[PDB]
């Protein structure tokens, strides 16, 4: 349910969100292997699964 951003990522498309290294994001949906939907600063969208780490 929470994930740590391991790298910066800037949205490159409408369904994407931007994040900074060290940001703590709310994990909305990780059914897809490559793209995870998250919430950052009351924005929602996708980031690469590999660029974040679950906390549990």
Author numbering: 7 to 62
Question: What did the paper state?
Answer:
In addition to the standard model system, i.e. proteins such as hen egg-white lysozyme and proteinase K from Tritirachium album limber, we included phycocyanin from Thermosynechococcus elongatus, human insulin and the SH3 domain of α-spectrin (α-spectrin-SH3) from Gallus gallus.
